[PDB]
Amino acid sequence: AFKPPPRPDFGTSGRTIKLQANFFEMDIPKIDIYHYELDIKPEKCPRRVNREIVEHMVQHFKTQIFGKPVFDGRKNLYTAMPLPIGRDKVELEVTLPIFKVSIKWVSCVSLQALHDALSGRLPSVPFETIQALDVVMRHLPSMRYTPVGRSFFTASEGCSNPLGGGREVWFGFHQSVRPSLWKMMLNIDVSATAFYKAQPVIEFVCEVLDFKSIEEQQKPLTDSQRVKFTKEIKGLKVEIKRKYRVCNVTRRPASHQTFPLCTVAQYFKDRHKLVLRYPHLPCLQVGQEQKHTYLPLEVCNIVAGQRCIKKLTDNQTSTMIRATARSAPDRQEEISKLMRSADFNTDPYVREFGIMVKDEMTDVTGRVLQPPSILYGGRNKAIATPVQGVWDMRNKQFHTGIEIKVWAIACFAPQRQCTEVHLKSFTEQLRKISRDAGMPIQGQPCFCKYAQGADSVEPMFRHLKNTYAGLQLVVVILPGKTPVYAEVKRVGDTVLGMATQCVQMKNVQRTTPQTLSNLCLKINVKLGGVNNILLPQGRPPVFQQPVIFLGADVTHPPAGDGKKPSIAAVVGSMDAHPNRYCATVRVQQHRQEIIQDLAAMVRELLIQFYKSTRFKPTRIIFYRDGVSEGQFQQVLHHELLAIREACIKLEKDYQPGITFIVVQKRHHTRLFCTDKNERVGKSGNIPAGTTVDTKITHPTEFDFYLCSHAGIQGTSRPSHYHVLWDDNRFSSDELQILTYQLCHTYVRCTRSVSIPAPAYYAHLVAFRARYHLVDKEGRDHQALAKAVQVHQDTLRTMYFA
RNA sequence: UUCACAUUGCCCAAGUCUU
RNA sequence: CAAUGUGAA
Ligand SMILES: [Mg+2]
Ligand SMILES: [Mg+2]
Ligand SMILES: [Mg+2]
Numbered sequence: 110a111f112k113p114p115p116r117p118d119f120g121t122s123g124r125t126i127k128l129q130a131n132f133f134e135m136d137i138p139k140i141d142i143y144h145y146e147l148d149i150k151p152e153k154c155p156r157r158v159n160r161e162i163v164e165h166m167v168q169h170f171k172t173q174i175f176g177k178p179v180f181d182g183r184k185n186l187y188t189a190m191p192l193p194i195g196r197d198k199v200e201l202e203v204t205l206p207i208f209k210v211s212i213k214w215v216s217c218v219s220l221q222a223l224h225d226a227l228s229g230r231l232p233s234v235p236f237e238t239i240q241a242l243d244v245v246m247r248h249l250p251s252m253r254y255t256p257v258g259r260s261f262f263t264a265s266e267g268c269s270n271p272l273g274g275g276r277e278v279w280f281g282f283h284q285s286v287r288p289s290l291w292k293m294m295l296n297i298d299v300s301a302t303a304f305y306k307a308q309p310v311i312e313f314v315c316e317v318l319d320f321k322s323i324e325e326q327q328k329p330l331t332d333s334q335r336v337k338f339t340k341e342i343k344g345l346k347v348e349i350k351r352k353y354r355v356c357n358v359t360r361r362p363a364s365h366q367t368f369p370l371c372t373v374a375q376y377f378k379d380r381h382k383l384v385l386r387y388p389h390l391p392c393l394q395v396g397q398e399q400k401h402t403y404l405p406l407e408v409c410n411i412v413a414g415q416r417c418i419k420k421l422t423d424n425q426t427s428t429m430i431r432a433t434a435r436s437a438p439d440r441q442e443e444i445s446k447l448m449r450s451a452d453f454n455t456d457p458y459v460r461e462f463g464i465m466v467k468d469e470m471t472d473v474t475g476r477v478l479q480p481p482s483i484l485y486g487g488r489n490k491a492i493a494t495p496v497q498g499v500w501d502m503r504n505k506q507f508h509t510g511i512e513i514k515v516w517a518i519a520c521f522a523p524q525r526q527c528t529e530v531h532l533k534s535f536t537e538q539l540r541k542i543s544r545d546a547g548m549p550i551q552g553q554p555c556f557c558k559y560a561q562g563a564d565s566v567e568p569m570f571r572h573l574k575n576t577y578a579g580l581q582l583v584v585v586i587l588p589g590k591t592p593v594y595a596e597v598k599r600v601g602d603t604v605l606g607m608a609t610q611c612v613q614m615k616n617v618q619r620t621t622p623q624t625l626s627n628l629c630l631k632i633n634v635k636l637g638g639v640n641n642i643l644l645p646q647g648r649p650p651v652f653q654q655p656v657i658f659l660g661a662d663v664t665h666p667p668a669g670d671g672k673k674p675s676i677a678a679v680v681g682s683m684d685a686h687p688n689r690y691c692a693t694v695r696v697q698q699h700r701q702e703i704i705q706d707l708a709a710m711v712r713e714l715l716i717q718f719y720k721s722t723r724f725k726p727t728r729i730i731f732y733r734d735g736v737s738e739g740q741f742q743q744v745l746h747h748e749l750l751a752i753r754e755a756c757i758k759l760e761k762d763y764q765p766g767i768t769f770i771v772v773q774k775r776h777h778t779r780l781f782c783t784d785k786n787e788r789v790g791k792s793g794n795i796p797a798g799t800t801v802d803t804k805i806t807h808p809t810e811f812d813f814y815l816c817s818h819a820g821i822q823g824t825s826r827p828s829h830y831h832v833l834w835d836d837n838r839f840s841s842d843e844l845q846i847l848t849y850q851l852c853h854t855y856v857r858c859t860r861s862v863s864i865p866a867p868a869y870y871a872h873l874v875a876f877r878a879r880y881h882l883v884d885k886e887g888r889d890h891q892a893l894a895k896a897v898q899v900h901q902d903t904l905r906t907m908y909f910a
Numbered sequence: 911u912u913c914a915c916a917u918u919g920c921c922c923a924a925g926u927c928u929u
Numbered sequence: 930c931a932a933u934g935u936g937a938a
Contacts, residue, residue: 151927153926156925158927257925258922258925259924260924301917351928368929369929373929380929392929402928420918420919421932422932425933426934427932428933430916430918430933430934431933431934434917434935499914499937501937585911589911590911593911611911613911613912621912623913623937623938624912624937625912626938627912627913627937627938628912628913629912630912630913665919665920665921667919667920667931669919675921700920702920702921735920736922737921737923738922739923740921743922792916792935818915819914821914821916821936822916822935823934826915855914857912857913858912858914858937859938860913863914872930876930879930
């Protein structure tokens with residue numbers, strides 16, 4: 110229940126494609142390096158301060174110690190040759206514009222053993238060694254630039270990218286050290302993010318309150334203005350030599366604001382001989398909230414290098430997108446340009462440790478897998494062939510289409526804007542498209558009424574449920590973004606158990622065959638239909654025995670949030686196609702990735718699978734979304750055992766083989782076409798089906814990249830798959846092809862999607878639960894748990910489509 | 911709330927210390 | 930999923 114399996118073989122399927130990856134080969138010497146433990150007292154210091162302390166310690170004590178160490182900013186220091194130490198501590202007193210630094214040797218780190226691990230020689234990769242190289246590579250940029258996660262950012266020389274509101278775009282790069290089948294690799298990607306401009310607070314005020322200049326006006330701020338400014342500046346650092354965090358903005362102007370030693374303006378007159386230019390403006394309160402330290406706006410600058418953590422406005426987001434959007438070839442050139450300019454090999458710390466980094470992207474060969482054929486129904490039973498990741502439903506009918514006999518319309522958009530003529534026309538066109546699709550809407554709705562406001566939803570839906578026997582669907586027209594949507598889903602999904610399909614008013618007023626067709630995809634599925642199936646004879650051999658496919662995700666609350674639950678969702682296939690899925694969902698501890706109640710959720714799905722198919726799965730294939738490498742073992746330990754537990758508690762001796770695959774869409778690996786002639790479309794991305802399981806992948810374990818989707822814009826993220834457990838002993842070919850075919854089973858569109866349908870559905874399930882919780886997030890836990898519990902009649906449905 | 915792709919928001923990471 | 934773009938039968 111622990112060690113991941115070795116790669117069983119390499120994949121052979123599909124034509125070859127020449128690729129370049131944003132991995133840069135590293136040459137590492139075969140020598141021991143020395144690891145020391147550092148303690149700095151006081152140790153409440155920010156990581157950057159600690160680095161300065163060690164920096165000054167190193168320069169001050171050069172003679173008879175140190176005469177180029179690297180440091181992680183906490184407790185770990187490395188040198189390329191040993192120090193005058195033994196395991197002897199040395200207490201050191203460092204001074205800087207009052208610290209004591211203790212140094213204990215701990216161990217040798219042999220880079221020779223790392224070479225062995227990269228070979229077949231040694232069973233696993235020693236983390237401590239990778240960690241040491243990482244500290245070496247991060248040492249200089251950690252002090253030269255602003256670290257954010259595994260990235261580094263700086264203001265770009267010669268350019269300004271203002272966002273307004275005192276904010277601007279900074280450009281940067283991600284950096285990480287990775288082992289691979291070939292060599293150690295430096296993974297480098299470009300990025301951008303919002304930072305606050307290092308500008309005078311006066312200017313910051315003008316940008317926030319939308320003044321062209323101060324002096325408009327010389328009257329004190331309205332509380333409306335004062336409140337808006339306070340919200341933007343609270344928690345930011347300002348500088349006077351002297352740095353402070355702002356905790357509030359005073360109510361009174363500097364001319365009238367007092368403290369006991371006296372007005373603020375007068376104190377600065379007497380003590381600092383400064384006559385304030387704008388006495389009418391409030392002061393910044395800084396330092397301890399319970400003290401009385403106030404600074405006039407005029408003597409303060411926003412300090413450089415503070416990342417914006419708050420959400421960007423809509424206009425700011427727009428500007429950000431326009432500033433940073435790039436086609437794949439543009440992104441590739443930007444990474445390449447960055448590497449030539451970065452010049453890692455003249456970093457004196459990199460050089461101290463004898464490391465060389467290649468200035469060119471690694472060449473790797475991919476294979477482009479063949480897509481499955483897609484089987485439709487009706488009389489014709491059309492077969493669709495995906496091309497460049499896309500097909501469509503023209504002249505095709507659903508494998509199993511629902512006949513819609515009883516349905517209703519509830520229009521929450523105002524009658525003046527969404528007229529009865531609009532509704533009739535929308536209905537006419539929908540019935541036409543639905544008939545073509547093999548989902549005939551046999552007549553007019555049984556009910557069609559306007560309503561206004563969230564209060565009208567539950568009584569209208571109760572009336573519909575009680576009045577219309579056999580009601581299959583309520584189509585709900587919405588004026589745009591509205592609290593009514595969350596109310597419709599609360600009532601439909603959780604209170605009454607009724608199928609609902611919402612449509613925005615703009616898509617009723619003006620219809621297109623493409624939008625209506627996509628809408629029908631969702632309606633058929635919600636009503637129990639099977640849109641299409643993989644061509645049965647084209648599926649991998651795993652389908653010769655009963656198998657269930659699970660998709661699992663946890664979604665965490667937004668940045669800055671302190672009390673919202675994380676939401677766990679698990680879905681499971683319910684037929685042999687596989688097409689139909691059922692869902693389970695839970696609320697759990699804030700920011701916990703491990704799925705706490707997984708055993709109960711899997712039990713539920715196994716029971717429903719048997720009820721639906723009358724088979725007990727002989728295999729369980731578990732696609733687990735979003736777990737990072739540093740959490741593989743913790744997550745596997747709990748979740749693999751939970752799956753086993755669900756089986757054991759059900760029966761026997763019931764021991765189906767489990768394959769546990771982590772899917773990661775958000776990592777920093779990018780792949781590009783080497784040959785211009787392979788670039789697909791305006792965005793110039795690799796083609797759907799591109800698979801990589803060599804060179805840049807893990808030296809011993811079973812992992813691969815599969816970019817399953819067509820890239821429409823920007824640079825495609827190739828999904829990564831890591832097999833953490835495999836009782837079923839898949840070949841690489843079989844598992845890669847299986848995974849690709851599952852990306853073609855997603856019901857909401859006639860496209861190959863970027864992750865397998867079960868994983869994608871798990872996201873939709875988690876996001877629906879988040880909707881069920883809007884403004885609601887032991888006694889606490891039970892309340893949230895009730896909110897996300899669907900109605901009995903919804904339990905077995907694809908309500909999340 | 912037609913849908914996918916893309917950027918950000920999500921576990922690990924990162925961050926947090928005289929008026 | 931939300932904000933913002935690129936797109937589609
Ligand atoms: Mg997740
Ligand atoms: Mg942490
Ligand atoms: Mg959107």
